[PDB]
């Protein structure tokens, strides 16, 4: 008797967790950051 | 007395979010009428922190 329980995708080392976690990027963070700054550099340069 | 608390939130999420909307519009508006501003502008150094 094997398989008493049917995987559930589990098999997943905590360790590849770890790497995937930090594989992830956010650099949309700093795109929303760059859009910011970019509207409050406009707006300054807007007035000359 | 179950269906009256919820209808109890609804009446002061409600009563919350419209004095709130109209106490800041009227502020803002009693702000930036008379200086007379425009968007986009050097003026508006004060709205650089309004808007």
């Known amino acids: ?48 | 007395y179950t269906v009256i608390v919820l209808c109890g939130v609804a009446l002061a999420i409600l009563v919350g979010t419209a004095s709130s909307a109209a106490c800041i519009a009227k502020a803002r508006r009693d702000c930036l009428t008379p200086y007379a501003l425009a968007p986009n502008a050097t003026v508006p150094t004060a709205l650089a922190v309004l808007c």
């Open chain 1, 1 to 48: 008797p094997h398989k008493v329980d049917q995987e559930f995708q589990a098999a997943v080392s905590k360790t590849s967790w770890n790497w995937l976690l930090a594989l992830f990027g956010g650099a949309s963070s700093l795109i929303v950051v760059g859009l910011i700054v970019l509207v409050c550099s406009s707006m300054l340069i807007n007035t000359r």
